[PDB]
């Protein structure tokens, strides 16, 4: 579970494990795929997707997911998590605002991202309905058995941990997690690399002038922009994405039927939608003479139909056609 710098972490820029990168309000189904720097899913070892492993300290905390909250302008709905990554059904929102509850603390993370949800169709809803026609939307999956893409996930760079740099009663005293690789020296001249167990520091004294580092590359990370490079190498760790964008047919929009009214080679149409509906036509002469107008306000319109025919498209309701001799 990677940890990075959340931008407006409740107060201001903290370093949250759930630091939000790559917000994708690019689908249609009320859904956003998000990456936390935290890797929830199974535990550290082997069990139960529905548990929760973020970083506390240098360490993980692979425990229950109890009170996740993604949210935006309104509280979102989770869809599924896998890896670093969560899918959640959100409404539109100027921002994105994520957070669980460990239990002692709220411990959330928030971010800017322009979000919208147009459904696919000539109706510009704000939200998916219960009914209407199905038609080919873009949307992310529920599932994990997924390989359609993979993002590079090589090592972490080092990280700071000044909990290490204690004092040896006059000298600044570094320690190690588990024998991990601590990269160490101070502004003064003393040990210059640091690949060690718990060292002391002969020369410097102040904690604030030393290299508290953790080369702990036993587990790779996501290659966040808010990661410091592991300077050594491009290690392996090519790793999939679960939530591929797929060609789901969203349960989708439908605009109320029109009121057809006859006139001489002319369609008066008293019209009354639910939401802004893009109407348009095609006078089937080799003179096309089409028309487009989003209609949200109910409006009686007109169409000079010709002899050979016109067609009529009340939103994603199917196209009509008309003989006006």
């Amino acid at each position: 579970p990677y940890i990075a710098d959340c931008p407006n972490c409740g107060h201001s820029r903290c370093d949250s494990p759930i630091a939000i990168e790559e917000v994708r309000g690019d689908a249609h189904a009320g859904v956003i795929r998000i990456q936390t720097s935290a890797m929830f899913g199974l535990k550290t070892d082997g069990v139960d997707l529905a548990y929760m492993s973020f970083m506390n300290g240098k360490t993980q905390k692979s425990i229950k997911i109890d009170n996740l909250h993604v949210r935006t302008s309104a509280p979102c709905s989770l869809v599924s998590h896998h890896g670093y990554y969560i899918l959640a059904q959100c409404p539109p929102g100027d921002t994105v605002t994520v957070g669980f509850h460990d239990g002692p603390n709220r411990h959330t993370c928030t971010v800017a991202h322009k979000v919208e949800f147009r459904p696919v169709g000539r109706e510009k809803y704000r939200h998916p309905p219960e009914h209407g026609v199905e038609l080919p939307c873009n949307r992310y999956t529920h599932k994990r058995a997924d390989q359609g893409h993979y993002v590079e996930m090589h090592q972490p760079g080092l990280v700071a941990d000044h909990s290490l740099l204690s004092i040896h009663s006059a000298k600044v005293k570094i320690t190690v997690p588990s024998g991990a690789q601590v990269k160490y020296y101070c502004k003064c001249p003393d040990v210059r690399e640091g690949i060690t167990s718990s060292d002391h520091t002969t020369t410097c004294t102040d904690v604030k002038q030393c290299r508290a580092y953790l080369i702990d590359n036993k587990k790779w990370v996501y290659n966040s922009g808010r990661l410091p490079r592991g300077e050594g190498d491009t290690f392996k760790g090519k790793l999939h994405v679960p939530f591929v964008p797929v060609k789901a047919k969203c349960i989708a929009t439908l605009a109320p039927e029109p009121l057809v009214e006859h006139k001489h080679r002319t369609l008066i149409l008293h019209l009354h939608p639910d939401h802004p509906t893009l109407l348009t036509t095609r006078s089937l002469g080799s003179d096309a003479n089409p028309t487009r107008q989003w209609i949200e306000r109910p409006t009686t319109v007109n169409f000079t139909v010709t002899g050979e025919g016109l067609e009529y498209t009340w939103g994603n309701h199917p196209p009509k056609r008309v003989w006006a001799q």
Partner: nanobody
Amino acid sequence: QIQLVQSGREVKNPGETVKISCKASGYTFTEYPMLWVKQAPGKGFRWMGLIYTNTGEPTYAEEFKGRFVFSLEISASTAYLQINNLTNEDTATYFCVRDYFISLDYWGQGTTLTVSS
């Protein structure tokens, strides 16, 4: 059903290397990785790391990153522990173990090393 049978106990003078085998039986090797635990004479039980028997990547406990190297004869359902440049305070018993069910479910018999000139 599941049997993890380990090599027999060795004697080695300081400085030497040892390769301890763990031959797995009863499960599909590949869906369950291996835990290596050190139970030192007095001290009790300690996790030495885990090896992904699928990819082959090892995790070492920080106490064990360095002289210790996990590897596997995949092909024969064997996992192995290799301790190089043996230190005298490495005398102890090492167990292989199967990680499953949100913990460890089966332990091996143990291979005891006595580092001694």
